Short mmCIF file of C-alpha atoms in Angstrom, two decimals:
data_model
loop_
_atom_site.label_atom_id
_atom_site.label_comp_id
_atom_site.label_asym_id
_atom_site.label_seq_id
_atom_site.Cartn_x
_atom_site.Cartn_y
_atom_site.Cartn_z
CA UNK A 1 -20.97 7.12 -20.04
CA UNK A 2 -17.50 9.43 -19.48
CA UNK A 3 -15.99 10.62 -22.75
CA UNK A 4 -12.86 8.81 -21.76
CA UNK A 5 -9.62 10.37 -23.91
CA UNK A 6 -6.10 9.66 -21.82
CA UNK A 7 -7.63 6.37 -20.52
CA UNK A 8 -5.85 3.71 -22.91
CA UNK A 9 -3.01 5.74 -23.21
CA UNK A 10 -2.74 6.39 -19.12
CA UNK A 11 -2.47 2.73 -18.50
CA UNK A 12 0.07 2.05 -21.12
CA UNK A 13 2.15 5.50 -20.35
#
């Protein structure tokens, strides 16, 4: 899997 870091915060941004 992708270590994902800004992708809950990229959505809601």
């Amino acid at each position: 899997f992708v270590p994902w870091f800004s992708k809950f915060l990229g959505r809601i941004l």
